[PDB]
Each structure stands twice: as structure tokens, then as C-alpha cells.
Amino acid sequence: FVNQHLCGSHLVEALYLVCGERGFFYTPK
Amino acid sequence: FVNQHLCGSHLVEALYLVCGERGFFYTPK
Amino acid sequence: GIVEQCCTSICSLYQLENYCN
Amino acid sequence: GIVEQCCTSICSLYQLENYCN
Numbered sequence: 493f494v495n496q497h498l499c500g501s502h503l504v505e506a507l508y509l510v511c512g513e514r515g516f517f518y519t520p521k
Numbered sequence: 522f523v524n525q526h527l528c529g530s531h532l533v534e535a536l537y538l539v540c541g542e543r544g545f546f547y548t549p550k
Numbered sequence: 551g552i553v554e555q556c557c558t559s560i561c562s563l564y565q566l567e568n569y570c571n
Numbered sequence: 572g573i574v575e576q577c578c579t580s581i582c583s584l585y586q587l588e589n590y591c592n
Contacts, residue, residue, distance in 0.1 A: 494583065494584045495583060495584075496581060496582060497578060497579075498578060499578035500578075503574075503577055503578060503582070504534070504536075505530065506577075506582065507533075507587060507591070508530055508533045510584065511587075511588075511590070511591035512591075513549060513550055514550075514592045515546070515548040515549045515550065515591070515592045516546075516547055516592060517544070517545075517546040517571075517592065518537070518545055518546070518547070519544040519571055519572060519573065519590075520542060520544045520573065521543075524560060524562060524563075525560060526556070526557060526559070526560060526561065527556050527557060528553070528556075528557035529557075532552065532553075532556055532557060536566060536569055536570070539567060540567075540569070543570040544570070544571045545570050545571060547569070548552065548569075548592055549553050
């Protein structure tokens, strides 16, 4: 699911799934 | 949509929608 | 943190905005 | 940043993991 164009909620979802209990930061700008 | 219990992808989605172009950090631990 | 405040109890806009950059 | 690398071009696990805490 990660090796594609991922934008908006799709990108945030991928980060959620990959990062798990670590969490993540989403910094679009 | 924000004034409820929000867990997992639901919480991440709420952050996405509220924070917009600012982005956010999701730190579950 | 956010899970305690927004998942295990009722979230709020005030709380959520604290996690925006 | 992430948008340039993962939205306007093809994302990768390597790149995504750089944004985990």
C-alpha cells in the first residue's frame, strides 16, 4: 500500500498504518 | 465530528480535518 | 496524552488544536 | 517534504518511516 502516490487522508492513513504505536508527524508544508 | 470518542484512524482523521495545511503530530504513546 | 484525552474520554476542538503544527 | 516525495511522486516505506516518531 506504500509504493504509490499518496495524498491527503490517503497519506495520513499510510503513516498511521506504517508507524503504529510510535505515531508520526504530518507536516504538509 | 470532534466532540466524541475518537480512536485510531478516527482520531488521525479528525486531526487531519481540523489541522488542515498546518499538519499535526500524532503521538499515541 | 491525546489517546487518554480524545479516545478513552470525549475529545474537544480545544484539545485537538493543541496537536496541530 | 513528504507531499513532494509521497504525493507528487511515488512514496516508499523508506521515506514514510522517516516521519514516524
